[PDB]
């Protein structure tokens, strides 16, 4: 919070760091050449774990003055190296012989567990400095604003492999002992301290030169080179993509992409040795599907994006941290768009983060992305899924509003401006404004100021060939009634798109005002003009009834892009609470999905319709909505059939799984009978089908199954060995409905605690199995609150559990009941989410009281 | 091998245990069933030669324990003791020359209030002790401390009352002691201390001082500046002259002077009304002042002097001391 | 082990009962047959 | 030295007027005791 006095600015580092395995200890020299701008007798070194042996400062050429200061502000992770004499001004060198250790808390310079092919459960030395962690490994100026060059040199056993930021330039012998050698790397360029990384372990060499010439390399343990080959190709394709993209050379002559056994942090951007989780990076050709390859391509390109935004121009302070990830995230998608065009990634991208962006802002705790930071500890709770998703959405907004070439020029100018120098978010806005001319900062300042996304009451005025209307900017509310005490209007650059060309927006306005007018040349009397374009604008366009009817034929067929169709589908479900008609219109858009083949549309449609079905518990008539689901799924179930069909992709496999599961949720008689048939065939072993179909088959058969099938399911789980297969089996067997069966499966969920920390997902499945059974399970976990809390001590797992358990509630009285339950049961880590869910429940109740009864009448029109 | 009813009764009554042994298995198992234990002391090598601590894990259930002793030559501090030290108070650790690695494990202990690393051969301050915020009495005895500047970090602590350095090889005393204020009973005897700066004397809360068995040559007048001293000892030191200003300080219950140099006790000894015991051996003295009898709580046995110097006193004063 | 007239005498006369057991079987079953009992300071390993 | 949970059971004994959890290690005041109004003596000795 206090930052540092910063009396001395580091220049160069010389770190003869020596890890000591089998003792988990650490030695070093820490010879730092720096400049003492402030004439002070005291030196501030932020560092926590290190125990300084000796320190000595020699200014320029004269003799050193040793050290007479060791004030250990342990709580502040600070150390004061006071000296008897003044240090005035000049360039000096501080040599600090010290000691540290490989922590087991997987922080700073820790030791990770890895297993050789034979076993031996040995340990390796690994690094990660996310925030205030570099100082724990070895004392420096742990400040992003502080920038200096480093010369990392390692003292490593010769059998062990060692990698660092730069390329190896020397492999000298170690004079004291010949079982280990001194590896000296090249001098790093100007970079931040938290970006320093060096690892030591046992891996194997897999190199691949790039078109530019840089050897992108991976070091999987046990030489599982094959596992790490697809990512090599992805990197070798996307790095030159960056090079030709912004015409800036890669900083490090060497780039490495090593993976670590149970990294426990997922990934971390570093200067040329970006570390990964083993599961995230390596890919067994026979133990993976194309979606996993898509995910690994996404993650491998994300850190390569971080190599440019980040390393080259680090954020001035953690307040701007949101950018360094957020912007990069969007960049990464664009990269894959240029790498695997067959992988249409924007389609799932809209469903990947944009959905929780939309749903999370609707609720409370929607704090603006840019929150002032003074202490790096605040990073943890200023951080959430919003910080990633909304940041990526707004940066993609900016790219669209600026244009591809103009954004290119702005990024190139910004990189060339403050290369190796800390820059603020305002500096990026200034550079973008210099490139384009239109004021980006005039919108970014408000984007930092307020919190959320607006709404528009569109209109309809087709004067000959001019479809003019009045966009009305106002704040959005989950219920619909926004607070609006301040100025709720925004200046979102909603980029309208002409629907004649699905990808090309012939008409597109950079509208940024609460009120405005339109200028266009209409092509067709029903042009079904698409406001926004593929939900590039992070926003919740509210179309009028005339607009919905005009675009209805566009969504009946495949003329509208699938991204537009899914965005509209998600918008209507959210706008059931705020916009009028709701269910009635909802039904009409359902009609369009008689012809939708897109998988992601079916996935988010199933999410929405399951939300409705669970939400309609209190007013019952599930048979009516399930019948409507059957009406929707008739052509889809026919086209997909039941059995695997020739020409089916992995996306088609997900299609068959979802359609079968939701058809069983509806409870079709013939579908249920066939599912029972295949259940019998599999349990007998006469015909065992794919697990992908099998798990939804379990869900369907137990949707109308007795206890014997439940016992058979438990048995099959017992002989089953594949962990996620058993997890799927448990979560789908949580979907029994009979009250005695639901009580029994609750007690069996107490029995199904076998899965390590997957018990949370099992009990989430059992909670989501029924609707009134969900309330019974809520009472059950009330009776087992202490068991759940002793299984999970304030983790994200328990917050996900409680959110899943209470998401289906729409009664204010028991909303207050569960609120009091949580008040008597403080869970601070999940605390925010707690009230979030509570408010959600209230909204749910309101939404029910808005339309549920009239829904009956709509069904009376459906069957008529 | 206690029987079950006696085991239960002992579980409900025993307070202190002192286990000494040679072989690891020698330690009884049933002692871990004890639940009202607070004082535990271990003597005999706990080293199980890697994969150790399997016996010691019973300390997990000894949640009522308050003070623990490890005289077993541990190369590393156990994880079990750090786990149980949440509620623990005293780590009397004796390594008999074995080098012990702190490995920041003491940071877990917060309720701890007394720490003693005896013969553990740290050679330096652990730098993890400063994390503790409830420590009051710290003892580093026989650990080959050469330079001890890190003691400045003690100014962060606020419950500290006694700093113990019974045996070491400290040469120069850091001036940064002046920042320390709350310490009272510094015992830094038996050290290669050539001189004492006024920086120690900027402190005002000093009750007990042990500047003995060192290479001190002269005493600064600032000892008299201290106004809370009770017991002082400059034994086995090359003290040529005793400054009269030291005698300004009152409440001096005892005052050790042994193996000193030729001196001359000032008559200002009369302003030692609180003196009860004093030694004047090993130093070349010839005429003890009559004002020695002025002391009201001074006993014949209390004043330890050679017989001849005892004789140089006036005979009536000798009688007064004898009858005391 | 106890005899029926003794059970009766305990029934109209016993007020408080102390029990400490090393094992479960040490607890007599007839202790519950008491009715005027008002205090029972049991001790042992009744966790069972 | 072992942990115990009230599990809302304490609210049932309306006649209870004196409660203590000796070495029961609750680390938290139970909410069940609040609804009961007859208590006069309360001890939470050695519960961390």
Swiss-Prot record, chain A:
It is an enzyme of class 3 (hydrolase). Its cofactor is Zn(2+). Strongly inhibited by bestatin, leuhistin, actinonin, amastatin, 1,10-phenanthroline, DFP, PCMBS, Zn(2+), Cd(2+), Co(2+), Cu(2+), Hg(2+), EDTA and puromycin. Not inhibited by PMSF, and only slightly inhibited by leupeptin and aprotinin. Activity is increased by Mg(2+) and Ca(2+). This is Puromycin-sensitive aminopeptidase. Optimum pH is 7.5. Stable from pH 5.0 to 8.0. Zn(2+) binds at residues 302, 306, 325. Its EC number is 3.4.11.14. Aminopeptidase with broad substrate specificity for several peptides. Involved in proteolytic events essential for cell growth and viability. May act as regulator of neuropeptide activity. Plays a role in the antigen-processing pathway for MHC class I molecules. Involved in the N-terminal trimming of cytotoxic T-cell epitope precursors. Digests the poly-Q peptides found in many cellular proteins. Digests tau from normal brain more efficiently than tau from Alzheimer disease brain. It is found in: Cytoplasm, Cytosol; Nucleus. GO terms for biological process: cellular response to hypoxia; peptide catabolic process; positive regulation of protein targeting to mitochondrion; protein polyubiquitination; proteolysis. Binds 1 zinc ion per subunit. One of its GO terms (molecular function) is metalloaminopeptidase activity. The modification 3'-nitrotyrosine is found at residue 414. Keywords: Aminopeptidase, Cytoplasm, Hydrolase, Metal-binding, Metalloprotease, Nitration, Nucleus, Protease, Zinc. Substrate binds at residues 130, 266-270. The gene is NPEPPS. Monomer.
From Swiss-Prot, chain B:
A motif (Di-leucine motif) lies at residues 225-226. LRR repeats lie at residues 12-34, 37-61, 62-84, 86-108, 109-132, 134-156, 158-180, 181-203, 205-226, 227-249, 251-272, 273-295, 297-320. It is found in: Cell membrane; Lysosome membrane. GO terms for biological process: aspartate transmembrane transport; cell volume homeostasis; chloride transmembrane transport; cyclic-GMP-AMP transmembrane import across plasma membrane; intracellular glucose homeostasis; intracellular signal transduction; monoatomic anion transmembrane transport; monoatomic anion transport. It comes from the Eukaryota. GO terms for cellular component: cell surface; cytoplasm; lysosomal membrane; membrane; monoatomic ion channel complex; plasma membrane. This is Volume-regulated anion channel subunit LRRC8A. GO terms for molecular function: cyclic-GMP-AMP transmembrane transporter activity; identical protein binding; volume-sensitive anion channel activity. Keywords: Acetylation, Cell membrane, Chromosomal rearrangement, Differentiation, Disulfide bond, Glycoprotein, Ion channel, Ion transport, Leucine-rich repeat, Lysosome, Membrane, Phosphoprotein, Repeat, Spermatogenesis, Transmembrane, Transmembrane helix, Transport. It is linked to Agammaglobulinemia 5, autosomal dominant: A primary immunodeficiency characterized by profoundly low or absent serum antibodies and low or absent circulating B-cells due to an early block of B-cell development. Affected individuals develop severe infections in the first years of life. Residues 1-324 are cytoplasmic. N-glycosylated. Expressed in brain, kidney, ovary, lung, liver, heart, and fetal brain and liver. Found at high levels in bone marrow; lower levels are detected in peripheral blood cells. Expressed on T-cells as well as on B-lineage cells. Belongs to the LRRC8 family. It comes from Homo sapiens (Human). The chain holds residues 482 to 805 of 810 of the full protein. Its main location: membrane.
Curated annotation (Swiss-Prot), chain C:
Expressed in brain, kidney, ovary, lung, liver, heart, and fetal brain and liver. Found at high levels in bone marrow; lower levels are detected in peripheral blood cells. Expressed on T-cells as well as on B-lineage cells. Signal peptide: none annotated. N-glycosylated. It comes from the Eukaryota. LRR repeats lie at residues 12-34. It is found in: Cell membrane; Lysosome membrane. Heterohexamer; oligomerizes with other LRRC8 proteins (LRRC8B, LRRC8C, LRRC8D and/or LRRC8E) to form a heterohexamer. Can form homohexamers in vitro, but these have lower conductance than heterohexamers. In vivo, the subunit composition may depend primarily on expression levels, and heterooligomeric channels containing various proportions of the different LRRC8 proteins may coexist. Interact with GRB2. Interacts with NOX4; this interaction prevents the ubiquitin-mediated degradation of LRRC8A. The volume-regulated anion channel (VRAC) channel forms a trimer of dimers, with symmetry mismatch between the pore-forming domain and the cytosolic LRR repeats, a topology similar to gap junction proteins. It is linked to Agammaglobulinemia 5, autosomal dominant: A primary immunodeficiency characterized by profoundly low or absent serum antibodies and low or absent circulating B-cells due to an early block of B-cell development. Affected individuals develop severe infections in the first years of life. Belongs to the LRRC8 family. This is Volume-regulated anion channel subunit LRRC8A. It comes from Homo sapiens (Human). The lineage of its organism: Eukaryota, Metazoa, Chordata, Craniata, Vertebrata.
């Amino acid at each position: 919070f206090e930052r540092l006095p910063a009396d001395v600015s580091p220049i160069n580092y010389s770190l003869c760091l020596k890890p000591d395995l089998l003792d988990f200890t650490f030695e070093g020299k820490l010879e730092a050449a720096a400049q003492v701008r402030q004439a002070t007798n005291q030196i501030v070194m932020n560092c926590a774990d290190i125990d300084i042996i000796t320190a000595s400062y020699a200014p320029e050429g004269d003799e050193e003055i040793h050290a007479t200061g060791f004030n250990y502000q342990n709580e502040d992770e600070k150390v004061t190296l006071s000296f008897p004499s003044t240090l005035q001004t000049g360039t000096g060198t501080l040599k600090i012989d010290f000691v540290g250790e490989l922590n087991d808390k997987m922080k700073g310079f820790y030791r990770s567990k890895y297993t050789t092919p034979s076993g031996e459960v040995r340990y390796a030395a690994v690094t990660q400095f996310e925030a205030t962690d570099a100082r724990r490994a070895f004392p420096c100026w742990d400040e992003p604003a502080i920038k200096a060059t480093f010369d990392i040199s390692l003292v490593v056993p010769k059998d062990r492999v060692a990698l660092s930021n730069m390329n190896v330039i020397d492999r000298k012998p170690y004079p004291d002992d010949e079982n280990l050698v001194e590896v000296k790397f090249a001098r790093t360029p100007v970079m931040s301290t938290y970006l320093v990384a060096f690892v030591v372990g046992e891996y194997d060499f897999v190199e691949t030169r790039s078109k530019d010439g840089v050897c992108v390399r991976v070091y999987t343990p046990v030489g599982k080179a094959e596992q790490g080959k697809f990512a090599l190709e992805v990197a070798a394709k996307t790095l030159p993509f960056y090079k030709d993209y912004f015409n800036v050379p890669y900083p490090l002559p060497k780039i490495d992409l090593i993976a670590i056994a149970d990294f426990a942090a997922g990934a971390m951007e570093n200067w040329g040795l970006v570390t990964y989780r083993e599961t995230a990076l390596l890919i067994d050709p026979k133990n993976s599907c194309s979606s996993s390859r898509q995910w690994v391509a996404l993650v491998v390109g994300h850190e390569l994006a971080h190599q440019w935004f980040g390393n080259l121009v680090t954020m001035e302070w953690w307040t701007h941290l949101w950018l360094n990830e957020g912007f990069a995230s969007w960049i990464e998608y664009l990269c894959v768009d240029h790498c695997f065009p067959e992988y249409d990634i924007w389609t799932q991208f809209v469903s990947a983060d944009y959905t929780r962006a939309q749903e999370l802002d609707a609720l409370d705790n929607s704090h603006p992305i840019e929150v002032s930071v003074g202490h790096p500890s605040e990073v943890d709770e200023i951080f959430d899924a919003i910080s990633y998703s909304k940041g990526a959405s707004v940066i993609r907004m900016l790219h669209d509003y600026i244009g591809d070439k103009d954004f290119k020029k702005g990024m190139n100018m910004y990189l060339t401006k403050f290369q190796q120098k800390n820059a603020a978010t305002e500096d990026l806005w200034e550079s973008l404004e210099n490139a384009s001319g239109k004021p980006i900062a005039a919108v970014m300042n408000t984007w930092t100021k307020q919190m959320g996304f607006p709404l528009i009451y569109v209109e309809a005025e087709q004067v000959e060939d001019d479809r003019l209307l009045r966009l009305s900017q106002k704040k959005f509310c989950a219920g619909g009634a926004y607070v609006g005490e301040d100025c709720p209007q925004w200046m979102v650059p909603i980029t309208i798109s002409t629907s004649e060309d699905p990808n090309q927006a012939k008409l597109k306005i950079l509208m940024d005002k609460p009120e405005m007018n339109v200028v266009l040349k209409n092509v067709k009397p029903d042009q079904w003009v698409k406001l926004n374009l593929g939900t590039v604008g992070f926003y919740r366009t509210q179309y009028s009834s005339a607009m919905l009817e005009s675009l209805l034929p566009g969504i009946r067929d495949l003329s509208l892009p699938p991204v537009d169709r899914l965005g509209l589908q998600n918008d209507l479900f959210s706008l059931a609470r705020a916009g009028i008609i709701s269910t009635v219109e909802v039904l009409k858009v359902m009609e369009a999905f008689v012809n939708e083949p897109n998988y992601t549309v079916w996935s988010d449609l199933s999410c929405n319709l399951g939300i409705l079905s669970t939400l309609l518990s209190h007013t019952d008539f599930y048979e009516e909505i399930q019948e409507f689901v059957k009406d929707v799924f008739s052509p889809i179930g026919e086209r997909l059939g039941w059995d695997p069909k020739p020409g089916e992709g992995h996306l088609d496999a997900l299609l068959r799984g979802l359609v079968l599961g939701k058809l069983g949720k509806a409870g079709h008689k013939a579908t249920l009978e066939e599912a029972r048939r295949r259940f019998k065939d599999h349990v007998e072993g006469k015909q065992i089908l794919s697990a992908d179909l099998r798990s939804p088959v379990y869900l369907t058969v137990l949707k109308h199954g007795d206890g014997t099938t439940l016992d058979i399911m438990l048995k099959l789980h017992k002989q089953a060995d594949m962990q996620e297969e058993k997890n799927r089996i448990e979560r789908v067997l949580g979907a029994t409905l009979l009250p005695d069966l639901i009580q029994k499966v609750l007690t069996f969920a107490l029995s199904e605690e076998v899965r390590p920390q997957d018990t949370v997902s099992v009990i989430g499945g059992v909670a989501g199995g029924s609707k009134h059974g969900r309330k019974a399970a809520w009472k059950f976990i009330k009776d087992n609150w202490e068991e759940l809390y002793n299984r999970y001590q304030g983790g994200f797992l328990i917050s996900r559990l409680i959110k899943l358990s209470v998401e289906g509630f729409a009664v204010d009285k028991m909303a207050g009941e569960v609120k009091a339950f949580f008040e008597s049961h403080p869970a601070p880590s999940a605390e925010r989410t707690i009230q979030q869910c509570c408010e959600n429940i209230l909204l749910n109740a309101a939404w029910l009281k808005r339309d549920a009864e009239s829904i009956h009448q709509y069904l009376l029109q459906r069957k008529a | 091998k206690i029987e079950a009813p006696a085991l239960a009764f002992l579980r409900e009554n025993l307070r202190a245990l002192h286990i000494k042994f040679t072989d690891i298995k020698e330690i009884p198992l049933w002692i871990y069933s004890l639940k009202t234990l607070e004082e535990l002391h271990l003597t005999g090598n706990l080293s199980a030669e890697n994969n150790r601590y399997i016996v010691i894990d019973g300390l997990r259930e000894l949640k009522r324990l308050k003070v623990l002793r490890l005289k077993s030559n541990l190369s590393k501090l156990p994880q079990v003791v750090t786990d149980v030290g949440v509620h623990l108070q005293k780590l009397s650790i004796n390594n008999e020359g074995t080098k012990l690695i702190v490995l920041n494990s003491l940071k877990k202990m917060a309720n701890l209030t007394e720490l003693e690393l005896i013969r553990c051969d740290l050679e330096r301050i652990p730098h993890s002790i400063f994390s503790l915020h409830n420590l009051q009495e710290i003892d580093l005895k026989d650990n080959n401390l050469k330079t001890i500047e890190e003691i400045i970090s003690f100014q962060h602590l606020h419950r500290l009352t006694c700093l113990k350095l019974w045996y070491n090889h400290i040469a120069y005393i850091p001036i940064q002691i002046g920042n320390l204020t709350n310490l009272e009973r510094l015992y830094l005897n038996r050290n290669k201390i050539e001189k004492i700066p006024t920086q120690l004397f900027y402190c005002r809360k000093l009750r007990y001082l042990d500047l003995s068995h060192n290479n001190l040559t002269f005493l600064p007048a600032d000892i008299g500046l201290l106004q809370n001293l009770q017991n002082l000892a400059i034994t086995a030191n090359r003290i040529e002259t005793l400054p009269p200003e030291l005698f300004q300080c009152r409440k001096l219950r005892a005052l050790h002077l042994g193996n000193n140099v030729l001196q001359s006790l000032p008559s200002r000894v009369g302003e030692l009304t609180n003196l009860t015991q004093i030694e004047l051996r090993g130093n070349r003295l010839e005429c003890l002042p009559v004002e020695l009898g002025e002391c009201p709580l001074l006993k014949r046995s209390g004043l330890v002097v050679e017989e001849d110097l005892f004789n140089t006193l006036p005979p009536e004063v000798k009688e007064r001391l004898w009858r005391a």
